[PDB]
């Protein structure tokens, strides 16, 4: 069956971006998907998206600015400490100049740079560059 709806969302975005499409339909939606999309959008990787409100579970239409090289999930959500963040971001990111690791944190869902700014660790949700 379907576990990790965030994995499905990120893989659908990845495949739509590879196909060159300007919009992708993501279903089901969830809070974690919305926060991940907001993290991706604050860095200009996707652009505005819309939540279609069914009465069962969300749908999302994400507009796709052709900037996303790759958005992926890390399963399982390994717990990550601050001292171990550099190793994760050296394994997952193409450069030290761009690309973000998303972590769920007691302070919210946010990228690794802002996690460093808040001096906090968490669980790795995924990455995008």
């Amino acid at each position: 069956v379907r576990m990790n709806v965030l994995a499905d969302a990120l893989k659908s975005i990845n495949n739509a971006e590879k196909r060159g499409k300007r919009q992708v339909l993501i279903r089901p939606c969830s809070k974690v998907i919305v926060r991940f999309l907001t993290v991706m959008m604050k860095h200009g990787y996707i652009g505005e998206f819309e939540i279609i409100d069914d009465h069962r579970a969300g749908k999302i239409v994400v507009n796709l600015t052709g900037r996303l090289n790759k958005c992926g999930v890390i399963s399982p959500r390994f717990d990550v400490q601050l001292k171990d963040l550099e190793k994760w971001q050296n394994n997952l990111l193409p450069s030290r100049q761009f690309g973000f690791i998303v972590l769920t944190t007691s302070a919210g869902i946010m990228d690794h740079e802002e996690a460093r700014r808040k001096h906090t660790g968490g669980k790795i949700l995924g990455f995008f560059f």
């Binding site: 060159g20 600015t65 052709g66 900037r67």
Partner: protein
């Protein structure tokens, strides 16, 4: 493409597909740069200006160059509605 001082250090700045915003590689010989002549509103004659659309070879290979160029022209007002 910038360094700490601020000078640009790239050898050049490659074009991007007008339909996908992906970089058109220097060896993408299937990619095109269509030039679409602009027209005076009253006379309907070539006024010397043009709109330029760069399409990568990947889009032309999948058959989407037609619709992509049509959308680009429609957004620019060259192609009317309906």
């Amino acid at each position: 493409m910038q360094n700490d001082a601020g000078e640009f250090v790239d050898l050049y700045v490659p074009r991007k597909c007008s339909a996908s915003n992906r970089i058109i590689g220097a060896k993408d010989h299937a990619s095109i740069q269509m030039n679409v002549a602009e027209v005076d509103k009253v006379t309907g004659r070539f006024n010397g200006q043009f709109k330029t659309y760069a399409i990568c070879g990947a889009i032309r290979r999948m058959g989407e160059s037609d619709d992509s160029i049509l959308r680009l022209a429609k957004a620019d007002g060259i192609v009317s509605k309906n």
